[PDB]
RNA sequence: GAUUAGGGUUCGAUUCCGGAGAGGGAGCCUGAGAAAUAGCUACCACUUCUACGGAGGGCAGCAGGCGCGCAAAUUGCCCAAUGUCAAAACAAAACGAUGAGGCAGCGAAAAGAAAUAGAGUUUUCAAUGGGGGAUAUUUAAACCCAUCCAAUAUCGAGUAACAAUUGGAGGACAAGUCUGGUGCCAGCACCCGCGGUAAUUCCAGCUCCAAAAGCGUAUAUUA
RNA sequence: AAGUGUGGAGAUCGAAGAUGAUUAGAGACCAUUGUAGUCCACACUGCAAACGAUGACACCCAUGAAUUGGGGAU
RNA sequence: UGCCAUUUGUACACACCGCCCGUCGUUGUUUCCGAUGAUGGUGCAAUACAGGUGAUCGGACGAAAGUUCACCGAUAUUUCUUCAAUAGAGGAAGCAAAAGUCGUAACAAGGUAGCUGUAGGUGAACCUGCAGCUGGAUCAUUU
RNA sequence: GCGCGGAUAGCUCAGUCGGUAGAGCAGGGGAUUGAAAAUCCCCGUGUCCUUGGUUCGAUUCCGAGUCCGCGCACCA
RNA sequence: CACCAUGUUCAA
C-alpha cells in the first residue's frame with residue numbers, strides 16, 4: 001500500500017534492541033582533578049585526533 | 060522584600076562556545092594554574108576587561124584632566140599593589156597590555172607554588188582549602204585570593220596547622236587513639 | 242531618491258517610520274492582538290490539554306515515515322490542536338483522556354521540519370515528565 | 384532594569400516617590416484632615432447563625448483555604464533591633480500595643496565563594512572537610528555561621544561505597560572512517576539533512592567532547 | 607483599448623453563435639460566415655507591459671559622426 | 681534516422697525519457713459568507729426610585745418619631761448605539777499530505793511567440809476579439 | 824395501511840426454474856526493484872434469515888416470518 | 900508551415 005508505517009509499530013526498534021548493560025569502570029576524578037587528567041593526556045603526553053579509533057571495516 | 064543588599068555578576072560566558080583556538084588556550088590555563096572550571100578563567104577575563112576598558116577611557120581624556128589624575132592614579136595604584144605591574148610600569152598604557160596569566164600569577168594558589176610551600180600547583184590548592192596557609196597570621200582558605208605585593212613576605216604555614224606549630228592532624232590523631240585503647 | 246533632510250522635518254520622519262514598522266513581521270506580531278487571540282496558547286507557553294485521539298501523520302517528501310502524535314484539547318480555552326510525541330515508543334505512555342503538558346517546539350509556532358501541520362509538542366503526561374518516562378527515571382501514576 | 388561603539392531597541396504589577404481602590408456603585412457622620420471601609424446608611428451580586436421572631440458578612444493586612452492556571456511558600460517565633468501611636472524613660476509588688484517590621488521554615492528565581500583529593504618509593508606516608516558533638520558561642524529564644532577535638536582530660540575517609548551530572552560526537556559547532564541492532568520501519572534532525580540489509584546522524588555498549596552543582600527544553604525580549 | 611447609457615451610422619474586419627475541416631477528442635488554431643462591437647455625437651468608467659519595467663527640480667561631468675527648430679558669422 | 685561543429689533561445693542539470701499547469705477524486709486542517717440562535721460589558725436618556733443632605737413643619741419626653749419640598753443618587757426596567765466574544769442547515773476560498781483520474785497550458789519559434797489591460801466563451805489547464813508591450817524569435821537594408 | 828420486492832467470505836456481489844457454492848478486494852508469503860509503488864503467482868476462504876412441506880438433498884421450489892426498500896386509500 | 904500527446908516515488 002501507500003503507507004508502510006502504523007501506530008501499532010510504535011517503539012519497534014527500542015523493544016528489539018538487544019539490551020546490553022554498562023560495565024563496572026571505577027570512577028574518574030571529579031572537579032579540579034578531572035581537569036588535571038584532561039590536561040596531562042592532551043598536552044604533557046604527546047592533526048591531533050582526540051578520539052582515534054582502531055581500524056574497522058573501512059580500513 | 061524591603062532588602063537593599065546588592066549583588067552583581069562577576070563572570071561572563073564567551074560568545075561562540077566552540078572555538079578550537081580558545082578551547083585549547085583555556086585548557087592550558089586550567090592546567091598551568093590548577094583551576095577547577097572554565098568559569099574561574101572567565102572572571103579573570105571580566106576583571107581584566109574592566110581594567111582594560113577604564114584605562115582606555117582615561118586615554119581619551121587629556122592629561123591634566125580631573126578624571127585622569129584622580130582615578131588614573133588609582134588604577135596604576137592597584138596594579139602596583141597586587142603585583143599586576145612592576146614599579147617601572149607607570150605610564151597607564153601598561154594596563155592595556157595586561158594578560159590573563161598576569162592576573163593568575165597573583166592567586167594564592169600560584170604564590171604558594173612559587174614561594175616553595177608546595178610541590179605542585181594542585182598541592183597548593185589542597186593546602187589552602189585545608190587551612191594550612193596564613194597570609195598575615197590569617198588563615199586564608201580561598202584559592203582565588205589575590206595576594207598583594209606586601210603580603211608576599213608573610214605567607215607561611217598557619218600557626219594552628221599541623222604543618223606549622225599546631226596539633227597533629229587526623230591520621231596521626233586517630234592512630235594515637237588506636238594505640239591508646241591497647 | 243530616498244529620504245528627507247531639513248532641520249524642521251522631524252514630524253515627517255516620525256510619521257514615515259511608524260507606518261513602515263507595520264511591514265516588519267516581528268514588529269507587527271509584537272504590536273497587534275491577533276497574535277495572541279489566535280495563538281492556541283494564550284500568549285503563553287506550555288498549555289495543558291486532554292488527549293482526545295491518536296494520529297499518525299505521514300512525513301513530507303523526501304522523508305517517509307508516519308509521525309506518532311496526539312490530538313489534544315486545551316483546558317484554558319478549549320482549542321483543539323495536534324501535538325507531536327517525541328521519542329521511540331511514547332504513545333505507549335499516552336492513553337486517551339490523559340492530561341498532557343504541551344509546549345511548542347522550535348520555531349515560534351512554525352512546524353519543525355518533517356512533520357506537516359504539527360507545531361506543538363508533548364512535554365509531560367499525567368503530571369509526570371514524558372522524557373523521564375522514556376529514560377525510565379520514573380513511571381506513570383495509577 | 385535588560386542590552387548597547389555611536390545612534391538606539393525594549394521592560395517597569397514589584398521595595399523609594401506620587402496617584403487610585405478596598406466585592407461593585409453611591410451617600411454621609413465625626414474630626415484639624417476621610418467622601419474612611421479591621422466607620423456608618425442604602426441598593427445590587429454572592430453570603431453566615433437562628434429557638435424563624437431575628438442577627439450578621441467584606442483577607443487587593445499577615446498566615447493559610449478552594450478555585451483558576453504554564454506559573455509562586457509556614458493557619459511558624461518575637462517586639463531584641465528599625466519605627467509609629469500615646470496619658471508613656473528605665474527600674475521598683477510594677478515587662479504598653481503592634482502579622483508595620485524583624486527572625487526562622489519552605490525556596491536550583493538570580494547572584495558570590497567553593498569539595499569530590501594531594502605527595503612519594505605494585506606499595507606506603509600525610510592531610511581536612513561533609514558529618515557527629517561541646518566548658519561553650521551566637522540568638523529576644525533557638526538556628527546558621529565561627530571556633531574547637533584537650534586547656535589535666537574530647538569522634539572520625541579509603542572501592543576515600545562519603546561513588547557527578549546534563550546534553551552531544553556528519554556540518555555550523557568542540558569531539559569516533561569503533562562494535563552490536565533495526566532496514567525510508569522505528570525513530571533522529573532548531574536548519575542542512577539521516578534511515579530503502581556494510582547508518583560518521585536512529586536504538587544501544589565502549590571511548591571521547593563541552594559546560595559542570597549544574598545542564599537540557601519551551602515562550603517572550605535585547606544584541 | 608475593451609465596456610456602459612441615449613441617439614445616429616452600419617462599408618470592412620469581427621468577441622458570442624453557426625457551419626466546414628484537422629484531431630484520439632477540438633468546446634482551439636485553419637476555411638466560410640456572423641451578433642455585440644469597430645465609426646460619430648453627448649454622458650459614464652478610470653481597470654494597461656499607462657514602459658525607459660527608471661519620481662520631480664537643480665548641480666558637476668571626457669570624446670567623435672550625425673539630426674530637428676531658432677539665432678549669429680562668410 | 682542519427683552524429684559533429686558554429687549561432688541563438690531555455691523555467692532543463694541523473695539534463696526533453698527533462699521540467700511543469702489547472703479541474704477532478706481521497707484525507708486533515710484555518711478562514712470567510714449565511715436564514716436563524718445567542719453572551720458579556722460600556723455609553724446614551726427614559727421613567728420608577730432605596731437611602732441620605734438641606735429646608736419646612738412637628739413637638740412625644742431644649743428636643744426624638746413623623747409631615748412636606750428641593751438636591752446628591754444607588755439600584756430596577758426599557759429604548760437604540762457601541763465594543764469583545766459565540767452556535768448554524770447550506771454555500772465557498774485557501775493550505776497541507778509516497779507513487780489515483782483527465783488533458784497538456786507554460787519553458788525551445790514548447791510546436792498557434794509569450795505576456796498586460798478588457799470583454800465574452802468554455803470539463804480543466806485555457807481559447808477568442810480589440811488596443812498595448814518585448815521581458816521577441818528582429819538593435820539592420822529606397823543614402 | 825395493505826401489496827410488489829432483496830439478504831451468498833472482513834465487506835461488496837453473480838446464480839442450473841426444483842443435484843451442494845464464483846470471483847475480487849482486504850489479509851500472510853514469494854517473484855520484481857537500489858528499496859518502494861504498481862504488476863504477476865500462490866495461499867484464508869462464504870452452515871446462504873428461521874425453517875418447514877422435505878425431489879435422491881432446499882442455496883437453487885413454494886408458502887409462513889426478522890431484516891431493508893417500493894406500488895397505492897377518508898367524503899363533497 | 901498535414902498530424903506528432905505523455906513518461907510513477909525517493910535515491911545515485
Ligand SMILES: NC[C@@H]1O[C@H](O[C@H]2[C@@H](O)[C@H](O[C@@H]3[C@@H](O)[C@H](N)C[C@H](N)[C@H]3O[C@H]3O[C@H](CO)[C@@H](O)[C@H](O)[C@H]3N)O[C@@H]2CO)[C@H](N)[C@@H](O)[C@@H]1O
Nearest residue numbers: 072076346347348349550573594598599600601602603604
Ligand atoms: N528556538 C528556541 C530557543 O530556545 C532558547 O531557550 C533557552 C535555551 O535553549 C538556551 O540555553 C542555552 C543552551 O542551549 C546553550 N547550549 C548554552 C547557553 N548557555 C544556554 O543559555 C542559557 O544557559 C545559561 C547558563 O550558562 C544562562 O546563563 C543563560 O541566561 C541561558 N540563556 O537559553 C535559553 C534560556 O532558557 C530561547 N529562550 C528561545 O528564544 C529560542 O527561540
Ligand SMILES: NC[C@@H]1O[C@H](O[C@H]2[C@@H](O)[C@H](O[C@@H]3[C@@H](O)[C@H](N)C[C@H](N)[C@H]3O[C@H]3O[C@H](CO)[C@@H](O)[C@H](O)[C@H]3N)O[C@@H]2CO)[C@H](N)[C@@H](O)[C@@H]1O
Nearest residue numbers: 705706707708709710711714768769770771772773774775
Ligand atoms: N460549518 C459549516 C460546515 O461546512 C462544511 O463544508 C466543508 C466542506 O464543504 C468544505 O470542503 C473543504 C474545502 O474547503 C477544501 N477546499 C478542501 C477540503 N478537503 C474540504 O474539507 C472537507 O472535505 C474533506 C473530504 O474530502 C474532509 O476530509 C474534510 O474534513 C472536510 N473539512 O470545508 C468545509 C469544512 O472545512 C459542510 N458544508 C457542513 O459541515 C457545514 O456546512
Ligand SMILES: NC[C@@H]1O[C@H](O[C@H]2[C@@H](O)[C@H](O[C@@H]3[C@@H](O)[C@H](N)C[C@H](N)[C@H]3O[C@H]3O[C@H](CO)[C@@H](O)[C@H](O)[C@H]3N)O[C@@H]2CO)[C@H](N)[C@@H](O)[C@@H]1O
Nearest residue numbers: 002299302701702705706707774775776777778779780781
Ligand atoms: N495544496 C493547495 C493547492 O493544491 C492544488 O494541487 C493539489 C492537488 O490538486 C494536487 O493533486 C496531485 C496531482 O497533481 C497529481 N495528479 C496526483 C497527485 N497524487 C496529487 O497529489 C495530492 O494527492 C495525494 C493523495 O492522493 C497526496 O499525497 C499529495 O500530497 C497531494 N499532492 O496536489 C496538490 C496538493 O498539494 C494546486 N495545484 C496547488 O496550487 C496548491 O498546492
Ligand SMILES: [Mg+2]
Nearest residue numbers: 190219220225
Ligand atoms: Mg584547624
Ligand SMILES: [Mg+2]
Nearest residue numbers: 399400401402
Ligand atoms: Mg506606594
Ligand SMILES: [Mg+2]
Nearest residue numbers: 407408427428
Ligand atoms: Mg453591581
Ligand SMILES: [Mg+2]
Nearest residue numbers: 442444445446
Ligand atoms: Mg493573603
Ligand SMILES: [Mg+2]
Nearest residue numbers: 562563581582
Ligand atoms: Mg553501524
Ligand SMILES: [Mg+2]
Nearest residue numbers: 552584586587
Ligand atoms: Mg551513539
Ligand SMILES: [Mg+2]
Nearest residue numbers: 627628636901
Ligand atoms: Mg488544419
Ligand SMILES: [Mg+2]
Nearest residue numbers: 619620639640
Ligand atoms: Mg468575414
Ligand SMILES: [Mg+2]
Nearest residue numbers: 696698905906
Ligand atoms: Mg515530453
Ligand SMILES: [Mg+2]
Nearest residue numbers: 781782783905
Ligand atoms: Mg495523463
